[model samples]
Target: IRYTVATRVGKPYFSWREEPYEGNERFEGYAVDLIYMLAQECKFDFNFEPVRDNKYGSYDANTDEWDGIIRQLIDNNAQIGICDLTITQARRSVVDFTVPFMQLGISILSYKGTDIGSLHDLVDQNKVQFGTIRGGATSVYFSESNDTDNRMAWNKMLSFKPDAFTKNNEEGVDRVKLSKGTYAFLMETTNLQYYVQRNCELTQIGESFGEKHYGIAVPLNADFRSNLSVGILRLSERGELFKLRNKWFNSC
Candidate 1:
């Protein structure tokens, strides 16, 4: 059967906004490449729909189509979201997730500070700025209420201003490329490899750190996901997933 999955539009790294260009044809990431392989090698027909970054937020950056959107079937306005949706207890309360395909960890990206790696380092501070994608798991988990935005968890972390000089996750990566003084971007570990491969000046400093998985979440009502889940298992069992991971990552 033909399936349509919602995704973001961008190059090399997958994105929805075209204003700030990053990579060439980075329409999807490692997971997306696997999906494409499944469609071609396994004959699973799937379509991708580009979603707006502002779709899920009521803030100024909203795209206006949806108040908020989830990767899986929630009470939201869309169907299954085929992006890098992380599985979390808080997110699970709303929707269901499929088998994970990639592994990642929280990275504390800073210029050169041995004192900015963990909670112990950030202990009793209210001046640090934690920048990440709004309405995202990372951002919510690391809210900076005291230093910048009106978040309750402000202190060690804070929101970044969106002036001509400020930006979001992807934008901030751009900012990191040219940064020379004491500046850093706290993001996932996978993105570190991503930026490093691209030859960006930024480096992954601080602790090597925590673990997490990235999954393909579908609606709970979509019982057919059992087959997809098995497909993931089969891929894992046969080592196809690992092979594809290397290929998609361009390390092959």
Candidate 2:
């Protein structure tokens, strides 16, 4: 029998839709291949399953529940969640994660022909518009109003509440592309850098806002976490993980 691992349909990390790209029939990407290699190293069989709702995972403090892959794990719908899911405090409080397979942080995306130098500058000027992926960690950060260094900026940005919210990073990048000199998109540095490499019209602005880690997730008490952790450390030590990263990241 094969364990089911939940993921989302996204480029670079994961995808399922057809056409010019490979479909679910053959799920492949950085995370996909990493998980496959782990399975090979650990001698476990597994299969891919997309999240029912296409969300990464977000916790609702009031409702005391979650959506997306975290919900899948919480419901015991899958044995693993391997995608670009960042291990945040909110998530760690619930599901468990193995050693981080990747690291990233919040960053800004801007189209060519813009003078935007930093998020701080934008907040200070209060003239330029920006957007972030709705309901994600970046959004959570700006909305919290207690981030200290960013409190003033968050307060200022939220006052206008520009229609700068995006469905996902893909849409956020598209918004930045089309907005021309009008909008900046905030997202994870890894994705922002990936976008800049694939599209010359865009560029990442300023340094990352905060450090974050991406991990392969499993149920809170699952024994496989140890095996998964072992595979990550082993793969990392053999330099196989670095090779796989370059293989998928540069080629795709």
Candidate 3:
């Protein structure tokens, strides 16, 4: 049976459609597709629950409830949290994460003349604000990439006042609107390319945070960890992982 874990619908991460289109489905972006494909291949059936609260959760200097959400889920909520959850040193303390299903990082979206390469490169700029996927890894990367307590990425990439805008998966393509001024966003490579390719209004002006893993969140005490990891590695070995990679990143 499928366990409905929270999932978002946007371009590359998790975009749903009225009908199955090429490279998209009811609730599968290429990355989510890889997750479903891997799960099915490994004989794991997870029902996905759609999450509208995009701000995954904010970290409280006093509480750490943001991270606690993942921990609690593993401890009792369910078997897995199947969103575009990223791997980080801070998170590993609470639970186990599968190997990165899709490797993506933060990116800056700006006019043709902006220089946004990495967090450090953008920090000294005139203005900075980041558009993120709410509860996804982009916010975490932005927050940690900079030394801030809980914000994602940094403001070095902007020269004007930036605002944090929250829109669902479908409206992200509209990010190009900020090309008039400096606007930055942290997105997985999956959505970045889709937006980059879909319009010339925004330019991909930065690199991924670093080589990081995108894994399914499992409890620290679960037995399914080894099996999922093994299955992903096997998929990687058998060339299936490469196939998915090509299908998503390389092909477009």
Candidate 4:
């Protein structure tokens, strides 16, 4: 089995560089430890590697295909995907998720003192430009909705496009900081809180949008998903998972 990951500071999900970090030095994080423990319990050998595109994964509507770790796993190129990969309905249609390892929801990261008002205000008047991880749930939510009301809430903002259609939450946050008051980054609350802690200028704004769950993804019908779920449940029961969560988010 091969495990896929992406790195973001403060999140402590997974981070690596090929020269000293890939096969030479082991990747370390809450999920890395979990992967190893599960492998030990299941009696399997595996390699932990970064995804080719370095994306957690998302659906591409125009191409009617998947990209990033999700596509790689769907194509049978990998057996496991970790990091901050959310469990979404479109992803569930093609692959299976182990029991959710974490829960989160979408929120905005705005530069301090920016008057974004609310999601309603932004949509009605185009008060600000926002960036979302391209092809991720937020991007799809804005561009491709069928419901008229949902689309209407987005059409004006969508017309302005976005300051940065970034590939990951980290970059989206960076755009907000660099753009000053011109940009707001849409990302999960878990990530927003992490960034806000480290950088005082960036603040999580308004209420969160939809709730989400993060899960370790496996191919559809993979029996090992059950094994992974068992390991996660056991870890949660022992409260070790909470310890790791606190270690990463609470530590600088």
Candidate 5:
């Protein structure tokens, strides 16, 4: 059976050409290659489609609905959702996730010569502004964190002029690049590493904190969850997953 896989465009995970191609050929990257390997292990065919809203999925209290890939799976628009999708308690409540294929944590992206070096530095200083994707998992982490610095950082982002938050990781990265040492971007280490590797002007500051995992998402109680998890575990065991990550993130 052919399954519809929901994904979003992002570097080192999922991305497509400016001019798209037909069907599954339209996408490539770590997620694309991993899904193809999983399809082989599980013996299925699939097609790739971008999530309409380009969100990583978050619940909205007023509307009482989830958005992004999670919503797509909930509505049966796609059988699977993958990208840099982190496994979290909130997301798990609405959808099942395969075993984590990648592990990472939050970190900062800044210009090479910036004085900022840690979350503490970001929180303690007032001149440099910082933020992440407005509604993404990184933003959620800052909003929910109990750490004093995290809470302060979240509050600072909320108050920054010209809006500290960005629509996507690319936008956040671009802001850092152009801010002339006036801004920093908080993001997952996986994505941060990809950018630092290719962008000589950018540097990752501080050790990653708040460890998390990236997993493939399936609708709750999906029959294929077990098979998919097994495929991911097998790939991990055989080093295929690590190889794929290196292929995408280590190219620079």
Candidate 6:
């Protein structure tokens, strides 16, 4: 049987082809490569589709519905969802996740000359503005955080006149670049590093916080969960995952 995989368009993770391949869209990047490897090991055929809303996933309180990749899985539109999908407690309650293939954390991305050194820096002062992908894990972390500083940061993010949230990671990155030293972006360290390595003018500030991992998502009680987790573990043990990371993330 073939599996339908739901994913989002994100650099160094998964990106769609500019042109369709054989009349169907194709994807490439670290997640795409890892999924293909998993399919080989798990003995399954699969197809990839980008989430229609272009979000990783988030729950909307008003509609009381989940959106993005998680919604796709919950709605049975796809059997698998992967990208920079972080494994979190809230998400895990609704879906199954394979063992983390990559470990990462939230971090700051800013222009080289910015004075923002850490998350605290943003919350401590109003001189420099910062934001994350709207309705993403990073935003959720701040909004739901119990730490004092994190709560302050969330408030500061919401205080922006037009809303500090960016539509996506790409928009946040572009905002940082265009804002000169006036703005900073909060995002996953892995994706931040990809941009940092390529953009000489941009630099990552401070150590990554909020330890987390990127896991492939599946519907609850999915039979393939164990097989996919085992396949990921094997890839990690064989150093294939490390090689793949370098292939997509270390080019610069």
TM for every model, in the order presented, reads 0.71, 0.90, 0.71, 0.85, 0.96, 0.95
Q: Give the per-residue lDDT digits (tens) of candidate 6, residues 1-252.
A: 789989988887888667727412366888888888998988999988888888888888899999999999999899999999988777898899989999989999998887767777778998888889888888878988899999999999999766789888888888888888788899998889898888888898898898888999999999989999999999999999989998988843
Task: Report the candidate with higher TM-score, 1 versus 2.
Answer: 2
List the candidate 5 regions with Cα displacement exceeding 4 Å. 18-20
* lDDT (Cα, 0-100) at 175 in candidate 6: 85
TM-score of 2: 0.90
Among residues 3 or more apart in sequence or in different chains, the pairs in candidate 5 whose N, CA or C atoms overlap within 3 Å are none
Candidate 5: tens digits of C-alpha lDDT, residues 1-252: 888999998877888856717788877888889889999999999999889899889899889999999999999999999999988788999999998999999999998788877789889998988899877889889898898878999999999898998988899888998987789999999989888887889888889899889999999999999999998999999998888888888853
lDDT (10s digit) by residue, model 4, range 171-245: 788888888878888778877877888888888778987768889989899878888898888888888788878
User: What lDDT is obtained when candidate 6 is compared to the true structure?
Assistant: 0.87
Q: In model 1, which regions exceed 4 Å deviation?
A: 10-29, 40-43, 54-79, 111-129, 143-154, 159-168, 250-252
lDDT of 5: 0.89
Model 6 CA deviation exceeding 4 Å by range = 18-20, 23-25
* Clashing residue pair totals per candidate (backbone < 3 A): 13, 0, 22, 0, 0, 0
Off by over 4 Å in 4: 1-11, 17-24, 140-150, 161-164
**lDDT for position 227 in model 1:** 65
Considering summed lDDT, which 10 consecutive residues are worst modelled in model 4?
A: 2-11
Order of models, best lDDT first = 5, 6, 2, 4, 3, 1
Cα miss at 246, model 2 (Å)? 1.6
lDDT of each: 0.54, 0.80, 0.57, 0.73, 0.89, 0.87
Ranking the candidates on TM-score from highest down gives 5, 6, 2, 4, 3, 1
